[PDB]
Task: inverse folding
């Protein structure tokens, strides 16, 4: 029976903007208002240069902005008029106190919940859209229950999103699944159905999965944990390959041809990054500790410990290969983004590799085709330090890769940009100090090893014995 | 592409060797395939109407070519002598004493085969490891060969691991997800590899035959099983978290599995994985890591096992705590003893371990399984007096539950969801519990509560 | 105050059930009290002139009302059937195998009683745990009753722990510091609690009857014993420090105990506390804590036991070090085997442990106790007809035999007779150097005289 005609989305960020933009585009008869405290970001959504870069996003926004898609700072009225209110704010990791570095900080979710109840009457569906710790919905419900009004009936749902950087629009238009959690009560099921009906405008019913609220919240974190575990698992095998003479790409292919295991997310690397995996796994581990499930905690912690070991051993190879001394040695870092085809550096392995080398006094020359130089400088700087001394002494940002390798002892590939396999390595060899090393942290130079040895490089890569 | 295999000898007529070489013979009528073994009784059984291994389809495969191009014989020496390709298909059991006790593989049989092969061989042959071996096995075979060389003797060593699951061996051989062959990157090595590919190409598409180096091949078999076991431990770990929060493990498993990068197979929570492969292979991986000074990698894979161990123990603990932390002289029905449904195999079955935890509490177990022989259950629960005092093997599940305090489902036999639970309830002591260690009774919980049971299952909050 | 108990059935005719229900019958002539047990021999003994439990005053209490309103019988079913209040007074021994081995309580007997009670009951009854139980026991009984319900069957579950110390059971029952009763906060619960109070009000002042919730009641019994054991481990820990500094433990104990907030009882340093209560109950508390994810609390109480274990072990070590770290074939007199004086009970007695430490050194022990039967000493020192005991242990008929040709005299139990022995005589026939190790401070004041005779005399809490 219930039909959603007006949607408010609190938070115009990496999740809220694109998700609500696609909803508006697929549901012309639903008014969608995306709001945010940050005036400058709203203005950018209302501009020709969107604050988030994602392929296809511009054309989605432009097709319905001003018609049924709106971006505004008027949060109150947008809540007031809405049938469904999406909560799409960040829950950052606590930087102090109990659970420091692992527990989520619910301050913004809570502030939204309180603002919602303050500005609401009658019936609304309130839906968690950004990634939240398990039990977030219970907290929202508690705020609502404690701040009740006559005829106020707020229903709380979970609707996690599954966007990957660089494929957001394809992820929204053709998702593997849509996930919605709500209570097993009649009102709960009514709210769930209403949100399903929104998605049914473009997503087949058999791809919409409905669960209880807890299952939903837990599924998001668990899904990321399983993905991260695949990477840490094949990375663990890469270490074994180096020790034995096996080759991690051969092994990955053999394993992945078993259709029970599948062939995705088995690309060995110096280590996974991004703003999702580490944060979500660490949150899962904290949840387990809080619930007195230490065995489960220890089990998932291994995903992070392995990623840390993969980075550290890669850094150790480089340092050992240069005689355990890197003081004043020029080293080229090729790739700073957390993966290719993005400028995002969040939890990028390049930051950690770089930091290990800076602790050895290396002169790093860093090249990335898309990451802005100011971001590199921030990432490698000591917190609060506005003119950090180490970065100033040790870090150069190069404008091209040949500058970065000119007079270098080693070339360290940390991000799998396609352009790195196309470089003129003969030319690079000539102006490097000898012995000249290439450390391939992404297996991008596979099939070029003989070529590179013949030129005179010592070429090493993860998951291949030296 | 020059060398052509026309005669094959397989040393070992076991779970792996017999079926595999039978299928090869069936698919390659022009190749003579001779499977050999020291065990005379087993060879006779292969030559009989009652095969020593039960696998669906295997009888009809063997009967279609036995006596024509498929032979089973005790004459190991002449089989090797005549062969172009010699498969080594013997077990490498876990060491029961000494360095690596309980984890390291015992290469005695592989070594014996390697010595016998070089003793009975001249000229050119391809020698291929077919059963599961530790990484570096091929190096050992190669060392024996190199140390025992003859003029004109040219033996090539390959790895060709098996991917047979109990109950599906024939489908797994006729329609494999992939065939895996490893050999050296040398010209002789690559000729050996191509010769063996040509055998498989009689019925497997080229695109499903993967060739690697020897190490990659050996490591792939252990690793694949480690990944499969990890999926089970990972979802089992989520099952504990579901019990603590109100999330439901089947809901979470479905949600996770619909991500095509993760896939939807091997996400059925359980009391714990069993079988002769997973624990043995993971523990061998862990031991390899420790021997190579990779303690971080060792610890990472050990968690797969630790989690399995925890899943069993906490299941046992739920039962015991539910019965007031005393089980002395209490009758408990154990339904299911096999390590999975539709087999009689009990190796490393979770039912053994759950049963042993309850025996430690002095429970009177009444065990029912539709296929496991009673004498195996007795052996499994015996010390290498308690069994006699505490264990009864029931001939049907209603006997097992008659006067019982709890019904514990450990194996997912389909028949267990169809039992007359109203009848069972009547003759059980009260309070009457059902512990479903396989989620087979999903959807029946309201009904069972109405009858009067306390029904609990893994991955569901009480 | 409506409900009135007129018939009481007590399941378990043991150390707790017999005396407790005997006193009830003695103080409440108009209530019929029937004590029952599966052990026929024990019921006969309660119906005999030689009672199966020795406690001062107990004979005269039983004889004053047995056959009148006090009955001992093996007919458990009819006793339950007729009863208004059913006491459950069976043992809950420590689990000897499985989960919680050596610490968790085994509820088998409590459960068997609960099932038998519901089987033989109709209408209204009050069921009361009387023997010491782990926390949550009452919840278990309630679950069995709820699962095995009948029309008009209304069973109420209460907790009523006992506080009897070996040797003072009758005084502890007639003149208790308090009576403790727990039950639910519901109206039916409170009516059951008041009904049981009314029984005690026949001889205990209302102000000494404390009513609580069921959990508080169960936990109070364990906790009270934990506090008492903690006082002994605390003063014993001070005894070690005294030996290290020249302070004297009896001086310190006196000084501490004169603070009225601390009190002056249970501050007698010793080789270590024993008995069937303290170790068992503290270890059950520790287990409960672990099961509830309270490891800090678990560690906190475990220290009471670890300190008792240390006190014993360091005492044994003093002896062994003093005899040059070799005791093989050396004759050593153990004076005192009971867990405290004025009893034959040896359960968890420090003498057992001290003796075992010396047997592992190959000592020839000659053990004297004025009340412990020899057969019990042999059982206590045997492996669960033992070889070690046979080779190494002699049970002496008198203390002069035990000390004849001995290297050391080890006092482990504070029997009064040990301070009045002829130590000059003992000295003459001991091997030299002759030692006395006083594990109970019974020879305080005699040290100069003993040194003059020629002994090396050492005691806990006194620097050498
Ligand atoms: C947010 O919850 C989002 O998280 C994932 O998307 P990301 O934006 O984090 O990108 P990816 O998941 O594609 O890459 C993440 C890191 O993993 C490394 N990686 C990936 C695959 C592989 O085989 N090896 C490997 O190292 C990448 O290089 C990155 O460093 C998730 O995919 C989304 O579903 C999710 O919503
Ligand atoms: C030997 O190398 C062989 O190992 C596996 O075969 P299995 O005979 O062991 O059969 P399964 O893999 O089917 O069963 C293993 C156990 O895991 C449990 N399980 C399985 C899936 C799941 O979702 N949950 C779960 O608990 C089963 O109940 C079994 O107890 C392997 O399959 C073969 O590839 C390999 O050759
Ligand atoms: C049962 O719960 C019962 O347990 C206690 O009674 P006990 O029968 O155990 O005797 P005591 O408590 O008198 O003595 C116990 C052990 O402590 C030693 N002790 C005592 C006091 C002291 O200052 N120092 C010391 O070493 C004794 O020598 C015994 O070995 C409890 O008293 C009862 O309330 C309880 O109900
Ligand atoms: O009280 C508040 C707090 C925050 N915000 C706004 O909420 C938006 C949040 O944007 P963002 O930081 O991108 O958070 P999310 O959109 O939740 O996305 C993050 O988390 C995702 C998965 O959950 C990752 O995929 C992304 O890369 C990562 O940026 C920001 O614009 C904030 O200004 C408000 O309007 N009000
Ligand atoms: O010189 C010889 C000649 C023959 N054999 C025989 O080798 C055969 C081996 O058969 P089997 O014991 O069944 O080993 P596998 O075929 O390798 O199978 C084992 O290991 C598999 C994984 O590799 C599991 O799937 C199986 O359940 C498990 O039995 C036996 O018949 C032995 O008699 C020798 O050991 N030495
Ligand atoms: O199903 C059963 C089991 C036992 N009994 C009898 O119950 C009595 C149990 O009494 P007992 O073994 O003496 O236990 P309690 O009376 O609880 O006394 C023990 O526990 C006390 C701590 O509270 C200590 O003070 C005592 O020394 C110690 O014997 C025995 O006669 C048993 O035969 C039954 O009637 N039915």
Result:
């Amino acid at each position: 029976m219930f039909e959603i005609k007006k949607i408010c989305c609190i938070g115009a960020g990496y999740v809220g903007g694109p998700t609500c933009s696609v909803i508006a585009h697929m549901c012309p008869e639903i008014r969608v208002t995306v709001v945010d405290v940050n005036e400058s970001r709203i203005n950018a959504w209302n501009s020709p240069t969107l604050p988030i870069y994602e392929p296809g996003l511009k054309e989605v926004v432009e097709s319905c902005r001003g018609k049924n898609l709106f971006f505004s700072t008027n949060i109150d009225d947008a809540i007031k008029e809405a049938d469904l209110v999406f909560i799409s704010v960040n829950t950052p990791t606590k930087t102090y106190g109990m659970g420091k570095g692992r527990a989520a900080d619910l301050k913004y979710i809570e502030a939204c919940a309180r603002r919602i109840v303050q500005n609401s009457n009658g019936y609304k569906i309130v839906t968690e859209k950004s990634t939240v710790p398990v039990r977030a919905a219970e907290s929202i419900r508690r705020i609502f229950d404690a701040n009740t009004k006559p005829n106020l009936n707020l229903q709380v749902l979970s609707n996690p999103q599954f966007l990957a950087e660089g494929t957001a629009i394809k992820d929204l238009k053709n998702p593997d699944r849509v996930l919605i959690g709500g209570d097993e009560t009649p009102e709960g099921q009514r709210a769930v159905q209403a949100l399903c009906a929104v998605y049914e405008h473009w997503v087949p019913r058999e791809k919409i999965l409905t669960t209880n609220t807890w299952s939903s919240e837990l599924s998001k974190l668990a899904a990321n944990a399983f993905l991260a575990q695949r990477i840490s698992s094949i990375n663990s095998i890469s270490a074994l390959c180096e020790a034995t003479g096996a080759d991690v790409e051969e092994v990955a292919t053999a394993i992945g041809m078993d259709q029970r295991i599948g062939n995705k997310f088995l690309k060995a690397s110096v280590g996974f990054g991004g703003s999702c995996f580490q944060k979500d796994v660490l949150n899962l581990v904290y949840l387990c500790e809080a619930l007195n499930l230490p065995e489960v905690a220890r089990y998932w912690q291994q995903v992070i410990d392995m990623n840390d070991y993969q980075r550290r051993r890669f850094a150790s190879r480089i340092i050992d290969s240069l005689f355990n001394t890197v003081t004043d040695k020029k080293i080229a870092i090729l790739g700073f983004a957390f993966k290719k085809d993005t400028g995002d550096t969040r939890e990028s392995s390049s930051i950690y590799i770089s930091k290990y080398l800076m602790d050895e006094g290396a002169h790093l020359h860093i090249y990335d085709p898309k990451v802005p130089r100011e971001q590199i400088v921030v990432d490698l700087s000591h917190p609060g330090v506005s003119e950090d001394d180490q970065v100033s002494r040790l870090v150069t940002i190069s404008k091209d890769p040949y500058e970065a390798c000119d007079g270098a002892h080693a070339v360290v590939i940390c991000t799998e940009w396609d352009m790195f396999k196309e470089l003129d390595y003969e030319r690079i060899h000539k102006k490097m100090l000898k012995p000249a090393f290439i450390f391939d942290g992404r297996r991008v130079l596979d099939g070029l090893h003989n070529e590179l040895q013949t030129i005179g490089f010592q070429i090493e890569t993860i998951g291949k014995k030296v």
